[PDB]
Design a protein around this ligand. Structure first.
Ligand SMILES: Nc1ncnc2c1ncn2[C@@H]1O[C@H](COP(=O)(O)OP(=O)(O)O)[C@@H](O)[C@H]1O
Ligand SMILES: [Zn+2]
Ligand SMILES: [Zn+2]
Lengths: 242, 524, 601
């Protein structure tokens, strides 16, 4: 039942969940009662089980359910028993770029946004590797400012990652990949919502920069260090005896 | 919804195992022999499904006798390799099985001979009609089976091989070696080896038929009435149930005798083993307890072990007549003691444990130290066997001779008359035939006590122990309470011998005088 | 059959609204107790859902190992509405059954009966292992450094995978025992009851599997009732089948018992103290010790002192004293010598019936023994070893060689064993109570000689016996009049023994009652008195060994009465015992000691 609920709640990755666990139960039951249905490794035995249980209740969905040789076999058997940017004009899918975005373990909402961007504005293109590259980079720089604000060892590792995920030794093209999308995507309300959420504004806060730029000297350029820093740095030399 | 069995009984001919050659193959042929073992019920492959290795297409048929391995034909033949197959268990039919090991009988045997043996196998509902340690008359057909035990043997050895001639361009020879044993099967088997009501109604009405039954049980032998009486009550068993705790009794009784050689002790053995339903004569010496009791297999022929049919395990509701008592080993008397103490046994080897049950009633044979029984010493210094084994015995006997010419002459007359072929010297009241049925009536009569009787039993034991009062004279083995329970089981046996329910003091007075006579005096 | 819909709703209806008497939902108690208990199992009486509807039992009988599927999940259902997060903790539930009427032997099994409900009888022997095997599986892959998800395992096979979620690669696979989850598996032997193997036949045997966290609920020598199912075993390597192609058979059994843990409650000890303090229990002790034989009271009393054990002490961890009591009996075999000791084995706590050679549990020593299973070297000890707190019985003490005698000597000497064999060296605690017996030379005791002169024993272990009791032929009429009457009536006040062992179990725990140095120099007095009176007419002496023993008896009776400390007018009992002990132990010359040493009575 644990494994049943596991594989059944593996579909997302009201009446649905209930009726589907009941379905898989009595389905597996019917399939194992008689002596007719054998040599079926339990390795895989809760999948077109789940697909036909989708087919049964009320509404069914061909996509995102089967997601192979024996998949067809067992189906019939049960059903009877009952570089990257020089490349010109490439093509992509939903899950291709879900992969290239989920490699950073970023959320799926940002990915859906880049997907919407694409399927509306993937029309007039030369190469979508550039656009989606720049997109997910300017997702990373905006959401990952904290860890980077304290760890400048990150910005080399990250750019190195996407330099070789798309197979180049030259990188200034990637720099352009970022600034051009930033020129493009600059002013949409959803981009706006993300900037108020994760608070980069060029990577710097609002309540600081406005005094940086309106015309002030109270502007806190933190050359000096904060108090808790020293409060914890002192422990390193406390035990200096050893 | 239909499977069947068949059998043909009352064939005219018998063939011993040696009387079977290679022309009786596929032939019904009736044999009789003996058993030493059974084995484990394991239900058998009658029918059994298979299925395609590439679809659910089932085949509900079976290659059945041997060749139990591979069908060919598929309903939808379109396959890359239809040659091999899958299987299934449930869409199947099964039927029981059983194995025994079959054995020669003594009364048909040659010289320089072992009881040559071999295996037989059962089938179907006729099973449960096997039995260990009994003669039986089988009937079936000369089934055979492969073997490789017969390797290392001389001359040339057949071998099978498919042909590669007339077809070509298609161990690669696929060679199998073939060499077999000749087992047997059985279609049916029987356990070899009314106005009787009026017969026995007439015999019972007498009074001295006690004496008749007494004297009729060894006309082959001369005198020694005590032997006759004791053996006649030995088969008779005592009620092992008369308790409340569930701690129990060795309901039956036990015996032995002493006597110098040149005596007719062994005549009695050969009699009773020549009469007894359940019995055995054995060595006394040339035996391990692994022979008396059961040493068993350790997982042979693949399948599980099976308790061996013990020799001393035998004598259920009977006897193990054993001669040559004195020359027994250390461990065998030990095992015997374990056998007698309770009516139960415990066994182990290779970690396996056992537990059995029996109520064996031994009669056996004493041989004194030098043979000469010094009449003025006591029993123990001459017997040479430790106390507990010397104990548990309700009885001891002694048979020793002396010069009496009047009677010695008629004894020699009897002996030499016995060298007249099948003479009428043994004219009894009657024969073994009615005796065996009389026993099967009488073994289960179950007698009862009374207050007068037991009240007299008490006072008679008082006088008995009062013979140990000035014991040590008419005394070679002294008194205890074993003697009284012995006497009580003897009253039980003897009322059963009478085939009447209520026992009186007069009948036990025979036991009174008996155990008074069972013992030996000595000098001042 | 897809009637799981009707079947499930109606069996859950049964499970919930069950009412039999007073509207009693009996199984609510079961499940709530389960959840209270972190329990894994639950029982369901077959007789009542069988009373209502038996085609329940039919769709069970056709394939009962498939009848399971609804019931285990239904247990979780009822469980979580009354115990959320139980399904979190206990991954799965098993069930148990009771009260099935059909009977088969271990031999009566026919093909028509299997794959259905089976109920047998037999005995559990040869218990092997509580081994673990799998129920949930995950992996360590090589082409990727990652895992598999969770997977339940069938009842009849291993598992192996060639697909991977990253690619269709059949890379090297290995299970992660360092993370997986397991359950309890036992292989068990089972044999018929020899009390009913009919004439001539032998008893067949079988093999048994025990699961569901019910392992080690059994021990060798128990009568058992496994209800279960039955089937074959396709355990591979089967094409090498000569003869006919016929297979073994094995039970999977669910329910289990032992019929066919002693401890004290508040009232159970309340009554103990109530009776212990009220007026001299000890007459009723010897009235209720062992009614096997009517016999005689004196040696019963001696061994009653042997029962309880006294108190040991050390003078700050030196000059130890033995608290536990010894005994030694002897006399003609005609009387009951090998009865009451086995009774005591039945009546004590952590008693033993060992023996010498032949019909023995063990050889009364310790040794580097093999084992039938897998050659497990082990260190068993003589039954002395087992009851280092308790007692060790023996019969036929005489029948021993050199070393089996030296061992018991060592025991009663320094209460510890030593071993110098086999790459192993050690001592233990042998502070056991000794009991024994033997057989005199010549049946009768030979009244006209002393002890060591009559029986051929040696003294140095003989000295440890505070008691050496003897009887002989009892020759008068009344002996007959009583013993024959009892032994025939065998076939024609005293308290339960359960209470008596529960009393000793209550006694060796609590009471260490003391002795007050108030008038104890009478010890010094009467000792010096009779130690001179001994030479006055006797040959051998009496020595401080006896004195120490009388003190141990004094504290013994203190534990018996359960009083707080020594009483004065019971030292009379202790010393009287040792007195009339030395009386019978000697020549007819002692017949003057009969008159001399009675004033101390
Ligand atoms: N007083 C008695 N009452 C009843 N039975 C007795 C009595 N005395 C002896 N017996 C029986 O006789 C036997 C005596 O055995 P025992 O002398 O202990 O054998 P061993 O001397 O070899 O240990 C006991 O088993 C007992 O059943
Ligand atoms: Zn096919
Ligand atoms: Zn892989």
């Amino acid at each position: 039942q644990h494994c049943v609920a596991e594989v059944l709640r593996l579909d997302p990755q009201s009446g649905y969940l209930k009726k589907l666990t009941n379905a898989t139960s009595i389905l597996y039951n019917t399939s194992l009662n008689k002596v007719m249905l054998k040599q079926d490794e339990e390795v895989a035995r809760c999948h077109i089980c789940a697909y036909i249980a989708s087919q049964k209740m009320n509404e069914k969905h061909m996509p995102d359910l089967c997601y192979p040789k024996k998949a067809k076999h067992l189906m019939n058997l049960f059903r009877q028993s009952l570089s990257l940017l020089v490349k010109k004009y490439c093509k992509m899918t939903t899950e291709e770029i879900i992969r290239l975005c989920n490699d950073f373990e970023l959320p799926r909402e940002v990915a859906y946004k880049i997907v919407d961007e694409y399927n509306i504005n993937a029309s007039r293109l030369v190469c979508p590797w550039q656009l989606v590259c720049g997109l997910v980079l300017n997702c990373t720089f905006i959401v990952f400012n904290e860890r980077r604000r304290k760890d400048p060892r990150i910005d080399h590792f990250i750019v190195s990652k996407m330099c070789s995920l798309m197979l180049t030794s030259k990188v200034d093209d990637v720099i352009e990949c970022v600034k051009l999308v930033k020129e493009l995507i600059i002013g949409e309300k959803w981009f706006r919502d993300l900037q108020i959420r994760y608070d980069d504004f060029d990577g710097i806060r609002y309540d600081e920069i406005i005094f940086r730029k309106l015309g002030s000297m109270l502007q806190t350029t933190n050359i000096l260090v904060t108090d808790d820093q020293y409060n914890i740095w002192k422990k390193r030399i406390e035990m200096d005896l050893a | 919804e239909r499977v069947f069995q068949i059998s043909f009984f009352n064939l005219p001919t018998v063939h011993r195992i040696r009387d079977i050659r290679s022309e009786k193959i596929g032939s019904l042929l009736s044999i009789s022999g003996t058993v030493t073992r059974t084995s484990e019920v394991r239900p058998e492959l009658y029918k059994a499904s298979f299925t395609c290795d590439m679809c659910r297409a089932i085949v509900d048929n079976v290659e059945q006798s041997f060749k139990y391995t591979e069908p060919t034909f598929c309903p939808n033949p379109s396959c890359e390799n239809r040659a091999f197959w899958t299987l299934n268990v449930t869409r199947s039919r099964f039927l029981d099985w059983q194995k025994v090991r079959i054995q020669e009988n003594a009364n048909e045997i040659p010289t320089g001979s072992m009881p040559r043996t071999l295996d037989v196998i059962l089938r179907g509902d006729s099973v449960e009609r096997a039995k260990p340690g009994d003669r039986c008359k089988f009937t079936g057909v000369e089934i055979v089976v492969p073997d490789v035990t017969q390797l290392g043997l001389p001359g040339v050895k057949p071998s099978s091989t498919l042909d590669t001639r007339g077809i070509s361009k298609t161990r690669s020879l696929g060679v199998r070696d073939l060499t077999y044993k000749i087992s047997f099967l059985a279609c049916h088997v029987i356990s070899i080896g009314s106005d009787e009501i009026n017969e026995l109604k007439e015999m019972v009405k007498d009074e001295h038929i006690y004496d008749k039954l007494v004297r009729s049980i060894a006309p082959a032998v001369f005198g020694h009435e005590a032997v006759k009486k004791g053996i006649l009550l030995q088969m008779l068993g005592g009620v092992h149930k008369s308790t409340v705790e569930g701690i129990k009794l060795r309901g039956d009784i036990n015996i032995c005798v002493v006597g110098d050689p040149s005596t007719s002790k062994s005549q009695f053995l050969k009699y009773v083993v020549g009469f007894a339903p359940r019995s055995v004569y054995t060595s006394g010496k040339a035996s391990s307890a692994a022979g008396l009791t059961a040493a068993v297999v350790r997982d042979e022929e693949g399948g599980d072990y099976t308790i061996e049919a013990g020799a001393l395990m035998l004598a259920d509701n009977g006897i193990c007549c054993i001669d040559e008592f004195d020359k027994m080993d250390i461990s065998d008397q030990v095992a015997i003691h374990e056998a007698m103490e309770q009516q139960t046994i415990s066994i182990a080897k290779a970690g396996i444990h056992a537990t059995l049950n029996a109520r064996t009633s031994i009669l056996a044979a004493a041989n004194p130290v030098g043979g000469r029984y010094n009449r003025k010493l006591s029993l123990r210094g001459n017997l040479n066997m430790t106390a507990p084994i010397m104990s548990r015995f309700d009885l001891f006997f002694v048979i020793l001779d002396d010069c009496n010419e009047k009677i010695d002459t008629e004894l020699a007359s009897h002996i030499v008359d016995l060298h007249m072929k099948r003479d009428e010297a043994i004219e009894p009241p009657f024969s073994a035939e009615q005796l065996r049925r009389y026993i099967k009536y009488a073994r289960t009569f179950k007698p009862i006590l009374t207050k007068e009787a037991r009240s007299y039993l008490v006072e008679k034991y008082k006088e008995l122990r009062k013979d140990d009062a000035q014991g040590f004279s008419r005394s070679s083995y002294r008194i205890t309470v074993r003697q009284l329970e012995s006497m009580i089981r003897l009253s039980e046996a003897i009322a059963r011998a009478n085939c009447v329910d209520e026992i009186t003091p007069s009948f036990i007075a025979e036991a009174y005088d008996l155990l008074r006579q069972s013992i030996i005096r000595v000098d001042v | 059959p897809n009637v799981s819909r009707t079947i499930a709703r109606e069996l859950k209806s049964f499970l919930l609204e069950y009412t039999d008497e007073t509207g009693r939902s009996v199984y609510g108690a079961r499940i709530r107790t389960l959840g209270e208990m972190n329990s894994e199992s639950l029982e369901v009486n077959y007789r009542h859902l069988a009373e209502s509807k038996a085609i329940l039992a039919l769709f069970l009988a056709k394939c009962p190992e498939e009848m399971l599927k609804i019931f285990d999940l239904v247990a979780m259902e009822a469980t979580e509405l009354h115990y959320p997060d139980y399904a979190r903790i206990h991954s799965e539930i098993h069930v148990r059954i009771s009260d099935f009427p059909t009977i088969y032997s271990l031999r009566e099994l026919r093909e028509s009966n299997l794959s259905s409900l089976v109920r047998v009888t037999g005995v559990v022997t040869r218990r092997t292992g509580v081994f673990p095997q799998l129920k949930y599986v995950k992996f360590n892959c090589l082409k990727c450094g990652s895992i598999l998800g969770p997977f339940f395992q069938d009842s009849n096979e291993e598992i192996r995978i060639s697909f991977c979620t990253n690619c269709k690669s059949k890379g090297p696979f290995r299970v992660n025992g360092e993370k997986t989850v397991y359950r309890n598996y036992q292989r068990v032997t089972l044999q018929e009851a020899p009390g009913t193997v009919p004439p001539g036949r032998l008893p067949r045997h079988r093999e048994v599997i025990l699961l569901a966290d019910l392992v080690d609920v059994s021990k060798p020598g128990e009568e058992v009732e496994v209800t279960g199912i039955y089937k074959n075993n396709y355990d591979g390597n089967l094409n090498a089948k000569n003869g006919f192609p016929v297979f073994a058979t094995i039970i999977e059994a669910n329910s289990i018992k032992r019929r066919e843990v002693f401890s004290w409650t508040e009232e159970e000890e309340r009554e103990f103290r109530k009776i212990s303090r009220d007026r001299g229990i000890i007459d009723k002790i010897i009235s209720s010790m062992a009614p096997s034989i009517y016999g005689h009271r004196d040696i019963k009393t001696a061994v009653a002192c042997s029962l309880f054990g006294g108190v040991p002490k050390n003078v700050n961890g030196k000059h130890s004293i033995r608290g536990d009591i010894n005994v030694l009996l002897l006399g003609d075999p005609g009387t009951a010598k090998s009865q009451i000791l086995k009774y005591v084995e039945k009546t004590a706590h952590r008693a033993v019936f060992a023996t010498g050679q032949g019909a023995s549990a063990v050889g009364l020593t310790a040794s580097v023994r093999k084992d039938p299973i897998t050659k497990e070297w082990t260190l068993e000890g003589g039954a002395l070893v087992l009851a280092d707190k308790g007692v060790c019985l023996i019969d036929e003490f005489d029948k021993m060689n050199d070393q089996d005698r030296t061992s018991i000597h060592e025991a009663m000497e320094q209460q510890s064993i030593s071993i110098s064999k086999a790459g192993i060296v050690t001592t233990l605690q042998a502070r056991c109570s000794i009991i024994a017996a033997a057989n005199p030379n010549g049946g009768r005791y030979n009244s006209t000689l002393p002890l060591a002169q009559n029986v051929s024993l040696t003294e140095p272990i003989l000295s440890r016996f505070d008691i050496l009791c003897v009887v002989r032929d009892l020759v008068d009429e009344e002996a007959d009049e009583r013993l024959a009457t009892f032994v025939v009536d065998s076939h024609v006040s005293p308290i339960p023994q359960e209470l008596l062992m529960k009393y000793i179990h209550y006694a060796r725990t609590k009471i260490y009652p003391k002795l007050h140095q108030m008038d104890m120099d009478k010890v010094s007095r009467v000792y010096a008195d009779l130690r001179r009176e001994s030479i006055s007419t006797g040959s051998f002496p009496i020595t401080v060994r006896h004195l120490e023993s009388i003190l141990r008896i004094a504290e013994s009776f203190a534990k018996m009465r359960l009083s707080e400390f020594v009483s004065s007018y019971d030292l009379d009992r202790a010393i009287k015992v040792v007195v009339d002990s030395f009386v019978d132990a000697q020549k007819v010359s002692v017949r003057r000691q009969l008159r001399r040493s009675f004033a101390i009575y």
